[PDB]
Amino acid sequence: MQKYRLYEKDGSPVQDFNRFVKGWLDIEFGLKEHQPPKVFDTIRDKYNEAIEAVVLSGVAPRTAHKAALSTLTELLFGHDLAKELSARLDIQPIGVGGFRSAHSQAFAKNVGENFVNLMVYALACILKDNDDVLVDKGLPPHLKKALTLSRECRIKDTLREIKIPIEGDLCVFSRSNHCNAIVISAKTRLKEVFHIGTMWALFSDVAKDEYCLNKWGLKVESSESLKDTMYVFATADMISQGCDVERETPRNLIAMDASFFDYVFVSKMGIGHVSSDLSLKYGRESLFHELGCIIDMIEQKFDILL
Amino acid sequence: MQKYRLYEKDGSPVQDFNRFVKGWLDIEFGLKEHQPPKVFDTIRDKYNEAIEAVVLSGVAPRTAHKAALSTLTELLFGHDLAKELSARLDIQPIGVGGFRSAHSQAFAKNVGENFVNLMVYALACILKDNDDVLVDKGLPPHLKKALTLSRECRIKDTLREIKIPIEGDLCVFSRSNHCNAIVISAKTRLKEVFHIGTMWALFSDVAKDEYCLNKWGLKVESSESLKDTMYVFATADMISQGCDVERETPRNLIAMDASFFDYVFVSKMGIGHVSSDLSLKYGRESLFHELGCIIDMIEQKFDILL
């Protein structure tokens, strides 16, 4: 299998970036920076078949991807996504199928990574004709080092340099500025693990504030650069006591976790408290947005049209 | 079963506090603020039998409790604690026994709460003749409200007041000042859940800093009062890939989590990087201290002798 590289040895992203990314998830070729996706073939095709079905019904491609993103939880459950998108967009009642492979152990053991893969693919598809705004699973080299804090802690006699690598599952960033990015953390569920994200959500705030850098004795490569670095969370709310996002009002601890993120997206639609509108100008509408609103977020932030 | 109350209706702790606490764990009587301990009877007796055995060997009571605290992980595994304390203190090789009940499902389902119970009991025993410095499972009412942050977040039309209750599993506090306390978070293991503690460890810092209060739009009852509020973590390192604390050098993410706590105690002894000395005057010796050092921490902080 032929393998290419997304980034040059300096860290610069190769031209027509979103092409190599989409090809990697299409398994048209492997990549240097990434291992081939696992049991992603079926759900990737089921996604595209839904987009093809909706688009051929006069619906704009942007409208399709944005609607599919806000309904990815269905595709992850192996349900007929196109039957879902059609009902919402009120076009001709479509059937693409759904897939038994969803109920397999291999799929259930890779659903977490496939959720990340679905978002990367959906974004790569809509950004395929754009080489200014890029998308990649995980963080680009330059941003991963910029989001890495440092700390020196006393271990008896000697001193231990401690690294604080603020994580991200996927990233939408600018070619001319890798810090001008949207870092996305993704989990299929929230539960109490959401607190872990809040810690990272706080550190991303901390890394931008020279006062906070000093209070906790932290060293960052450049705090001013991270000014344009947005830090968000994306969840499928896949779920017992029920769900965490899909309810009349989210629980207090869940609400507080989402509040310290810049934005929190969910791949569900029709939830009362969840905002379907996203305007960077007028501020965060609610604690939870529909995942499709990330398109609007990308458009406004990077000043492009999809 | 007769039930008493640790706190009056105003919030003031009843006189001879540590007596009612020790009695509750002795199940001499129930309490209003606490439900009776579960499957704690066996391990509580096995603890005392070890202290009785060591003390009757000329060893001072303070020396016993401090050594037992730094070896609680053994008592939680159902091992012969007195055979362990004797070997360390180099007195007459003792046998108290150990207990089969450790390998029971009921004990395994309550080991997490019993770990908290063991620490509360051990501290209650050593503080039984002190009515100035108190110990209680969880936080006292006045401190629980003082450690509760507040935040207003926009939910579309309306505004949602969000509570941020900085948690604690047990607390050692002053009667004349409940904020002058040692808040202790306790888990039998660290793993990735330790990040959750780091979030709380950060919020405790945040709650003390009027700048940080304002940056994140947070309201606290009194930030100045929490100045004397110490926030620590206690773990049994009970453990595969091995342990997290019991190794030559703890993993990076584990180290960074411990670093944002004021102190981190472990109920193990003989670990190279773990400090057996604790001096508030000369600062935190290492990221991990022996749990027995919390006695020294209590003594120095509250200016008492045990």
Residue numbers in the entry:
A (entry chain A), B (entry chain A): 1 to 239, 246 to 312
Which lines from the publication concern this structure?
PfoI belongs to the CCGG-family and cleaves the 7 bp sequence 5′-T|CCNGGA ("|" designates cleavage position). The overall fold of PfoI monomer represents a typical PD…D/ExK nuclease fold with the structural core made of central four-stranded β-sheet surrounded by α-helices (50–52). The PfoI monomer is composed of an N-terminal α-helical subdomain (residues 1-131, colored pink-yellow and blue-green in Figure 1B and C) and the C-terminal subdomain (residues 132–312) that bears PD…D/ExK core (colored orange and cyan in Figure 1B and C). Structures and mutagenesis indicate that PfoI features a permuted E…ExD…K active site that differs from the consensus motif characteristic to other family members.
Interestingly, the apo-PfoI crystals grow only in the presence of the specific oligoduplex that was not present in the crystal. The dimer has the U-shape typical for other related REs. The dimer interface as calculated by PISA extends over ∼1890 Å2. Three different regions of the C-subdomain contribute to the dimer interface: a β-hairpin (residues 151–167), α-helix (residues 192–218) of the conserved RE core, and a region including residues 255–266, 278–282 and 288–293 that interacts with the β-hairpin of the other subunit. In total, the interface contains 26 hydrogen bonds and two salt bridges. Residues 239–249 are disordered in the apo-PfoI structure.
